[PDB]
Amino acid sequence: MDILFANPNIFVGENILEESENLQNVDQPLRVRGCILTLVERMDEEFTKIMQNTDPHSQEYVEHLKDEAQVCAIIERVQRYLEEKGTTEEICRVYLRRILHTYYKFDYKAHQRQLTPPEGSSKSEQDQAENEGEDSAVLMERLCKYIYAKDRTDRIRTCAILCHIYHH
Amino acid sequence: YDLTTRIAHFLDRHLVFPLLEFLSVKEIYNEKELLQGKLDLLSDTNMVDFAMDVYKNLYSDDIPHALREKRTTVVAQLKQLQAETEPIVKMFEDPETTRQMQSTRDGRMLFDYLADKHGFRQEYLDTLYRYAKFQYECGNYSGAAEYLYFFRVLVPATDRNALSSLWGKLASEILMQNWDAAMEDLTRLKETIDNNSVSSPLQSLQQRTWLIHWSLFVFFNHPKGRDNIIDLFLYQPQYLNAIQTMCPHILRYLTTAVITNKDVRKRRQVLKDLVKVIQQESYTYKDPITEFVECLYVNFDFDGAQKKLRECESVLVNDFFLVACLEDFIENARLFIFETFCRIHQCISINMLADKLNMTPEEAERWIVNLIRNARLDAKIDSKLGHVVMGNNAVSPYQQVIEKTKSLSFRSQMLAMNI
């Protein structure tokens, strides 16, 4: 992801340089850009499998919960690397990944942002990236409900609406 | 509810011609002013009500909106702006446009009389289609639109053009004050919503709101329109979910139109099925004057309630909205809370009612005698302590059970003794 963030489409070719470049041949540069999410998805898979099969009361279970923030941070790196033509098709899965990192959320974070005195609280450039960062998920959720009026994957629609009722 | 899931994806993306902007920085009774703004947008600009809006509190900013339409009557808007002294230097569209419209009406009017006189079926439809463009373009020319819509209405693309024409004739003649035409298109609109059209999410919602706009303001027999609107689409207090609902006001008029035209038995269903449903739960915390009426009624208070209702009368008698039956509402609000209070009561002092409502104790006694005279209260009245005393403690339930259990079974045995 750091190499991809540094790069912006060097080695893709896109007919500006061809000797020796090309992720558009052998083939389809958008497909190659979309496959990168599908690699992250195999880490997404295995992490879920570990936290399903490790013991409920082990110290390992407490330790591996720390890695969820590291996974979620990668999803934020990926969502900030799209690219409208990858966004339209991956949005159905990205909506679900946003739901996976939301649909078991607890009170305390919502209480911190909504109940900490605004006169005393944050006034500040970094803080008002990160706070807005957290409620970006419910900003996307309100957009995604309208976006899903385009789509017919009603297993995802039914699943997402149940998660929205949990979130609300 | 089905149609509610149709709303659920859309989320207050209603199509309204004024877009979003209404008369800003308003002072008195903010919930009423907010209600006027959502209503102005949803009625596609009212117009008439701007004068009412200014009459309650002085605002300059109808001028604002009022300058930007010409088809109310060009001369009226021009006189309104030049009375203010708005120095527009932009009033040049109308002499060209109106002159094209004059040539267009007379060069239609010659065909109007030929097509009627000949009666030919193609010619009448062609003359109607040649007319339909003109009356859409200017309905000011109101009686010309009414003559056209008296006969056929329908043009090749039927549903949209007929339904927009019914809304436009209903809107124009409500503004012009031609009630019989407005009563005709209130009737014609509720007939037309059966079939329906494509019924794409927002269309059905706009049709619900148009039914609210003609029903709301009260000219003639609006309690019949209250009966027609509530059981139409099955009983809701606002007719939309998705949190932003605020129309706000219809339940206030609806409750009174039940109370003054029907028995209140009957307000037990209104309390469950209109007041405690989540659409009103959403509206109540957007209107404390509506909230006091319902919340005092459902908790059965005797002396916080009656003062707060009298405090509410003071705001309500300064409501400049059309409603017709204003003191009818207020007087039967006083009666209905007293009738609700007296249902389980032991005693009431005549004086203790009088001080509370600011009336004289003889006036209070004669008012209580009018509850008794109408059979809205079983009582005895103490002549020498000045207290009214109730006593419906019904000793012995057994007999009316005994009536039913042995009437059916004994006669059923007598029926058996014949074969």
Side-chain angles (χ1 to χ4, degrees):
Chain A
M1 293 306 298
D2 281 299
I3 298 167
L4 288 163
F5 266 95
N7 181 267
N9 302 291
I10 272 67
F11 197 74
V12 186
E14 300 191 0
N15 296 89
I16 302 176
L17 289 172
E18 302 194 62
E19 295 185 295
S20 188
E21 289 215 4
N22 293 294
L23 297 177
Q24 59 174 5
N25 306 103
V26 201
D27 309 285
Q28 298 171 334
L30 183 57
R31 182 178 69 177
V32 185
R33 295 201 279 260
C35 287
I36 301 169
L37 298 98
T38 304
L39 296 174
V40 179
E41 186 167 85
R42 308 305 147 176
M43 204 185 81
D44 206 0
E45 271 191 61
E46 295 305 304
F47 192 51
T48 303
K49 297 166 196 171
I50 294 164
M51 293 194 295
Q52 190 159 344
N53 290 253
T54 299
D55 286 307
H57 301 288
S58 69
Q59 305 186 257
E60 304 166 44
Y61 207 96
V62 188
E63 197 82 294
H64 283 312
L65 191 59
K66 305 175 88 70
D67 284 305
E68 191 265 347
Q70 311 204 94
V71 180
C72 193
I74 293 165
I75 304 304
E76 288 289 51
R77 298 187 72 152
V78 172
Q79 286 192 231
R80 288 158 56 172
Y81 199 68
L82 297 175
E83 226 280 59
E84 341 74 71
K85 307 155 220 65
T87 300
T88 49
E89 314 317 300
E90 254 290 292
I91 192 61
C92 307
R93 298 208 288 174
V94 171
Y95 184 26
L96 191 63
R97 302 188 219 278
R98 213 74 178 179
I99 285 166
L100 292 174
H101 294 296
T102 305
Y103 76 160
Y104 75 110
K105 54 200 178 193
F106 291 96
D107 284 86
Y108 299 96
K109 266 284 174 167
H111 284 67
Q112 286 182 305
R113 301 196 300 277
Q114 293 174 58
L115 305 175
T116 306
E119 323 75 3
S121 293
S122 303
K123 296 289 183 286
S124 168
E125 57 188 293
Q126 296 207 246
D127 307 51
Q128 301 307 113
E130 312 311 300
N131 285 315
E132 323 309 289
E134 302 200 301
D135 280 310
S136 76
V138 63
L139 186 62
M140 294 173 197
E141 189 252 24
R142 292 174 286 187
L143 297 171
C144 289
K145 284 163 184 163
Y146 197 67
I147 298 169
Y148 236 78
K150 191 220 285 184
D151 194 45
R152 42 68 258 175
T153 319
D154 277 59
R155 281 165 167 63
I156 301 178
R157 195 207 307 298
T158 308
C159 188
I161 293 171
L162 293 163
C163 303
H164 302 144
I165 297 163
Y166 187 115
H167 304 169
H168 292 7
Chain B
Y1 180 128
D2 132 82
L3 198 145
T4 314
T5 213
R6 226 174 183 101
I7 311 178
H9 292 76
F10 272 75
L11 307 168
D12 207 4
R13 289 178 171 100
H14 293 95
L15 304 176
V16 288
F17 196 61
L19 307 171
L20 193 65
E21 304 303 302
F22 65 90
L23 208 171
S24 78
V25 199
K26 309 191 79 189
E27 295 181 298
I28 64 165
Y29 195 12
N30 230 247
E31 317 91 287
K32 173 63 48 159
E33 300 294 22
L34 185 67
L35 171 67
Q36 184 60 36
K38 261 277 191 178
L39 292 173
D40 188 53
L41 302 174
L42 291 165
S43 198
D44 292 300
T45 328
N46 277 42
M47 303 297 188
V48 180
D49 295 295
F50 290 168
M52 177 279 296
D53 199 60
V54 179
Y55 296 157
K56 55 167 168 53
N57 202 77
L58 183 59
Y59 303 124
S60 32
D61 288 68
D62 102 296
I63 305 293
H65 303 245
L67 285 160
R68 317 301 171 198
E69 166 60 299
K70 307 295 189 71
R71 293 144 41 111
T72 47
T73 289
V74 191
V75 187
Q77 307 314 128
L78 186 57
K79 288 184 70 177
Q80 189 182 356
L81 82 96
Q82 298 285 250
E84 190 72 8
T85 320
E86 221 268 56
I88 48 173
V89 195
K90 274 137 223 65
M91 57 279 185
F92 308 126
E93 323 80 70
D94 312 310
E96 177 50 51
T97 304
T98 299
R99 190 267 286 108
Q100 296 187 31
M101 290 173 173
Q102 290 169 257
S103 300
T104 302
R105 172 58 191 181
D106 274 52
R108 261 57 174 188
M109 187 163 65
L110 200 155
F111 295 120
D112 219 4
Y113 293 121
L114 292 175
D116 191 71
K117 177 176 168 51
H118 303 154
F120 190 56
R121 274 50 177 151
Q122 184 179 359
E123 181 188 10
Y124 197 94
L125 294 171
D126 165 42
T127 290
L128 172 66
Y129 197 60
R130 288 185 279 106
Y131 250 113
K133 181 194 186 299
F134 176 63
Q135 296 299 155
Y136 186 80
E137 285 169 348
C138 196
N140 197 230
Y141 321 115
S142 48
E146 180 148 277
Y147 198 72
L148 199 69
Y149 297 141
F150 186 77
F151 294 110
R152 177 53 74 102
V153 188
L154 311 176
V155 291
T158 48
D159 58 294
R160 286 140 265 175
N161 292 298
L163 190 61
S164 65
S165 295
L166 298 184
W167 174 236
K169 186 179 178 301
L170 185 52
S172 67
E173 302 321 300
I174 289 169
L175 297 174
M176 295 293 182
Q177 310 301 303
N178 294 308
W179 177 250
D180 307 76
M183 187 159 55
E184 196 205 18
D185 288 294
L186 192 193
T187 307
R188 194 150 55 211
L189 186 65
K190 62 83 185 169
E191 250 67 279
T192 301
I193 54 175
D194 174 81
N195 308 151
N196 183 288
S197 60
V198 184
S199 306
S200 289
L202 304 175
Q203 297 183 273
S204 305
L205 307 179
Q206 196 176 18
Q207 291 171 18
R208 287 173 169 209
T209 313
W210 292 336
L211 296 161
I212 297 170
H213 285 289
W214 98 268
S215 61
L216 182 69
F217 69 100
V218 193
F219 209 109
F220 288 173
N221 259 239
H222 292 239
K224 309 206 206 319
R226 184 239 73 85
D227 294 344
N228 283 201
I229 203 170
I230 206 61
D231 296 297
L232 179 65
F233 292 126
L234 307 181
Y235 43 84
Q236 282 143 84
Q238 293 286 266
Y239 283 91
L240 296 91
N241 294 77
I243 80 174
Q244 303 295 20
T245 336
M246 182 64 175
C247 195
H249 217 262
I250 190 171
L251 184 64
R252 297 181 180 199
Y253 295 4
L254 188 141
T255 291
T256 300
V258 176
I259 297 172
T260 58
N261 283 240
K262 311 185 198 306
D263 73 80
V264 296
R265 293 179 287 195
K266 210 190 277 59
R267 221 276 169 185
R268 242 177 177 152
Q269 66 191 111
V270 177
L271 184 60
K272 305 185 290 96
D273 307 314
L274 298 179
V275 182
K276 182 57 210 66
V277 300
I278 61 174
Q279 293 183 5
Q280 183 57 47
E281 199 178 302
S282 191
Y283 181 25
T284 295
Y285 200 73
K286 299 163 185 159
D287 182 349
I289 291 176
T290 298
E291 185 172 63
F292 282 125
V293 179
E294 299 296 354
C295 288
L296 299 165
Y297 167 67
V298 75
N299 290 297
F300 308 119
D301 182 294
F302 69 115
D303 226 308
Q306 299 193 68
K307 299 183 191 87
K308 269 278 179 274
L309 295 171
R310 201 57 158 143
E311 195 183 314
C312 290
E313 298 189 12
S314 302
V315 188
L316 294 169
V317 77
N318 287 278
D319 197 353
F320 274 52
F321 269 32
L322 298 169
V323 62
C325 293
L326 187 57
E327 188 66 10
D328 320 58
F329 191 156
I330 300 170
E331 194 272 347
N332 281 268
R334 300 170 191 137
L335 291 167
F336 188 54
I337 199 70
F338 192 70
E339 184 169 58
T340 300
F341 166 80
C342 289
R343 176 176 172 69
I344 57 168
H345 254 78
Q346 190 179 159
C347 195
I348 185 62
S349 192
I350 298 170
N351 314 296
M352 290 175 179
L353 184 64
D355 338 303
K356 204 185 318 312
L357 299 178
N358 200 111
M359 54 173 52
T360 189
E362 179 162 58
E363 175 190 2
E365 186 195 76
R366 302 291 145 71
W367 197 71
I368 301 170
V369 171
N370 282 301
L371 281 296
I372 302 170
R373 187 184 184 144
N374 274 282
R376 294 178 73 162
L377 179 56
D378 309 288
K380 67 149 195 164
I381 302 178
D382 209 286
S383 197
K384 305 199 173 192
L385 288 178
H387 285 216
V388 185
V389 186
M390 197 271 195
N392 293 14
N393 300 102
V395 184
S396 196
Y398 309 124
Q399 287 77 3
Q400 208 205 93
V401 186
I402 294 165
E403 177 191 349
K404 296 161 190 174
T405 178
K406 301 297 162 272
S407 289
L408 298 174
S409 288
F410 187 40
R411 293 176 179 161
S412 299
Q413 304 296 41
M414 289 296 194
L415 180 60
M417 298 177 183
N418 296 273
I419 303 180

Short mmCIF file of all heavy atoms in Angstrom, two decimals, chain B residues 25-44:
data_model
loop_
_atom_site.label_atom_id
_atom_site.label_comp_id
_atom_site.label_asym_id
_atom_site.label_seq_id
_atom_site.Cartn_x
_atom_site.Cartn_y
_atom_site.Cartn_z
N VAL B 25 -35.27 34.37 8.64
CA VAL B 25 -35.18 35.17 9.87
C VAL B 25 -36.53 35.56 10.49
O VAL B 25 -36.84 36.72 10.74
CB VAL B 25 -34.21 36.35 9.77
CG1 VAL B 25 -33.79 36.84 11.17
CG2 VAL B 25 -32.94 35.94 9.00
N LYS B 26 -37.38 34.56 10.75
CA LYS B 26 -38.73 34.79 11.25
C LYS B 26 -38.80 34.68 12.76
O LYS B 26 -38.11 33.86 13.38
CB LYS B 26 -39.72 33.81 10.58
CG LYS B 26 -39.60 33.82 9.04
CD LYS B 26 -40.74 33.08 8.34
CE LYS B 26 -42.02 33.90 8.27
NZ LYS B 26 -43.13 33.08 7.79
N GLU B 27 -39.65 35.51 13.39
CA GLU B 27 -39.67 35.72 14.83
C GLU B 27 -40.69 34.84 15.56
O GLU B 27 -40.38 33.75 16.04
CB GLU B 27 -39.97 37.21 15.13
CG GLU B 27 -38.87 38.19 14.64
CD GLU B 27 -39.23 39.62 15.00
OE1 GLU B 27 -40.27 40.10 14.49
OE2 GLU B 27 -38.47 40.25 15.78
N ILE B 28 -41.94 35.33 15.71
CA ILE B 28 -42.98 34.73 16.53
C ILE B 28 -43.36 33.29 16.17
O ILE B 28 -43.40 32.92 15.00
CB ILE B 28 -44.26 35.57 16.57
CG1 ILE B 28 -44.93 35.71 15.18
CG2 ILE B 28 -43.91 36.95 17.16
CD1 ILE B 28 -46.37 36.23 15.27
N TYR B 29 -43.67 32.46 17.19
CA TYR B 29 -44.14 31.08 17.06
C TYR B 29 -43.43 30.24 15.99
O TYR B 29 -43.95 29.97 14.91
CB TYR B 29 -45.70 31.04 16.96
CG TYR B 29 -46.35 29.69 17.19
CD1 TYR B 29 -45.66 28.58 17.72
CD2 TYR B 29 -47.71 29.53 16.85
CE1 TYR B 29 -46.29 27.34 17.84
CE2 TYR B 29 -48.34 28.28 16.96
CZ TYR B 29 -47.61 27.18 17.44
OH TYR B 29 -48.13 25.88 17.52
N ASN B 30 -42.16 29.87 16.25
CA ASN B 30 -41.24 29.37 15.24
C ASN B 30 -41.69 28.07 14.56
O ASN B 30 -41.50 27.89 13.36
CB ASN B 30 -39.82 29.26 15.84
CG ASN B 30 -38.80 29.93 14.92
OD1 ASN B 30 -37.94 29.29 14.32
ND2 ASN B 30 -38.88 31.28 14.81
N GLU B 31 -42.35 27.17 15.30
CA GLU B 31 -42.97 25.96 14.79
C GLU B 31 -44.04 26.22 13.73
O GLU B 31 -44.14 25.53 12.71
CB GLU B 31 -43.59 25.13 15.94
CG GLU B 31 -42.73 25.00 17.22
CD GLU B 31 -43.01 26.11 18.24
OE1 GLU B 31 -42.59 27.27 17.98
OE2 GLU B 31 -43.68 25.82 19.25
N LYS B 32 -44.87 27.27 13.92
CA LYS B 32 -45.81 27.78 12.94
C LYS B 32 -45.14 28.35 11.70
O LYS B 32 -45.54 28.09 10.57
CB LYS B 32 -46.71 28.84 13.61
CG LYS B 32 -47.68 29.65 12.73
CD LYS B 32 -48.78 28.83 12.03
CE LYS B 32 -49.53 27.86 12.94
NZ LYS B 32 -50.83 27.52 12.34
N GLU B 33 -44.06 29.13 11.88
CA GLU B 33 -43.26 29.67 10.79
C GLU B 33 -42.52 28.60 9.97
O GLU B 33 -42.49 28.64 8.74
CB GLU B 33 -42.28 30.74 11.33
CG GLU B 33 -42.95 31.97 12.02
CD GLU B 33 -43.78 32.86 11.13
OE1 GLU B 33 -44.25 32.42 10.05
OE2 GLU B 33 -43.99 34.06 11.46
N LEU B 34 -41.94 27.59 10.64
CA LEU B 34 -41.34 26.41 10.05
C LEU B 34 -42.33 25.56 9.26
O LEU B 34 -42.07 25.12 8.14
CB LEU B 34 -40.74 25.55 11.19
CG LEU B 34 -39.94 24.30 10.74
CD1 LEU B 34 -38.65 24.69 10.01
CD2 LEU B 34 -39.62 23.42 11.96
N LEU B 35 -43.55 25.37 9.82
CA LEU B 35 -44.68 24.74 9.15
C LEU B 35 -45.09 25.47 7.88
O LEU B 35 -45.27 24.85 6.83
CB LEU B 35 -45.86 24.72 10.15
CG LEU B 35 -47.23 24.27 9.61
CD1 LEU B 35 -47.23 22.79 9.22
CD2 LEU B 35 -48.31 24.60 10.65
N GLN B 36 -45.17 26.81 7.93
CA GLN B 36 -45.45 27.64 6.76
C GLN B 36 -44.42 27.45 5.66
O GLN B 36 -44.75 27.36 4.48
CB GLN B 36 -45.55 29.14 7.14
CG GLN B 36 -45.94 30.09 5.98
CD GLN B 36 -47.32 29.72 5.41
OE1 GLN B 36 -48.21 29.31 6.15
NE2 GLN B 36 -47.50 29.86 4.08
N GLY B 37 -43.13 27.33 6.02
CA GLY B 37 -42.07 27.08 5.05
C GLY B 37 -42.09 25.73 4.39
O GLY B 37 -41.99 25.63 3.18
N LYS B 38 -42.27 24.62 5.14
CA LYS B 38 -42.46 23.30 4.51
C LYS B 38 -43.73 23.24 3.66
O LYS B 38 -43.70 22.69 2.56
CB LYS B 38 -42.39 22.11 5.53
CG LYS B 38 -41.03 21.36 5.61
CD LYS B 38 -40.79 20.26 4.54
CE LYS B 38 -39.56 19.35 4.82
NZ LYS B 38 -39.38 18.28 3.81
N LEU B 39 -44.85 23.84 4.11
CA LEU B 39 -46.07 23.96 3.31
C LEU B 39 -45.92 24.79 2.04
O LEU B 39 -46.44 24.38 1.00
CB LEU B 39 -47.25 24.52 4.14
CG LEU B 39 -47.79 23.58 5.24
CD1 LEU B 39 -48.84 24.32 6.09
CD2 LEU B 39 -48.40 22.28 4.69
N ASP B 40 -45.22 25.94 2.06
CA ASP B 40 -44.99 26.77 0.88
C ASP B 40 -44.23 26.02 -0.23
O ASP B 40 -44.64 25.98 -1.39
CB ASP B 40 -44.20 28.04 1.32
CG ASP B 40 -44.10 29.05 0.19
OD1 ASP B 40 -45.17 29.39 -0.37
OD2 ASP B 40 -42.97 29.48 -0.13
N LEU B 41 -43.16 25.29 0.15
CA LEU B 41 -42.42 24.44 -0.75
C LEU B 41 -43.26 23.30 -1.33
O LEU B 41 -43.22 23.02 -2.52
CB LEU B 41 -41.19 23.80 -0.04
CG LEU B 41 -40.18 24.79 0.56
CD1 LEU B 41 -39.10 24.03 1.35
CD2 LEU B 41 -39.53 25.70 -0.49
N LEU B 42 -44.07 22.62 -0.50
CA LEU B 42 -44.86 21.47 -0.91
C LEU B 42 -46.14 21.81 -1.68
O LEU B 42 -46.73 20.94 -2.32
CB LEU B 42 -45.23 20.62 0.33
CG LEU B 42 -44.04 19.89 1.00
CD1 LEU B 42 -44.43 19.39 2.39
CD2 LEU B 42 -43.53 18.72 0.14
N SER B 43 -46.57 23.08 -1.64
CA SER B 43 -47.74 23.57 -2.38
C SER B 43 -47.31 24.32 -3.63
O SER B 43 -48.13 24.89 -4.35
CB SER B 43 -48.56 24.52 -1.46
OG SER B 43 -49.90 24.74 -1.92
N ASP B 44 -45.99 24.34 -3.91
CA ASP B 44 -45.35 25.02 -5.02
C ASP B 44 -45.57 26.55 -5.07
O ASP B 44 -45.64 27.15 -6.14
CB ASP B 44 -45.63 24.31 -6.38
CG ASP B 44 -44.96 22.95 -6.48
OD1 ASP B 44 -43.70 22.91 -6.39
OD2 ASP B 44 -45.67 21.94 -6.72
#
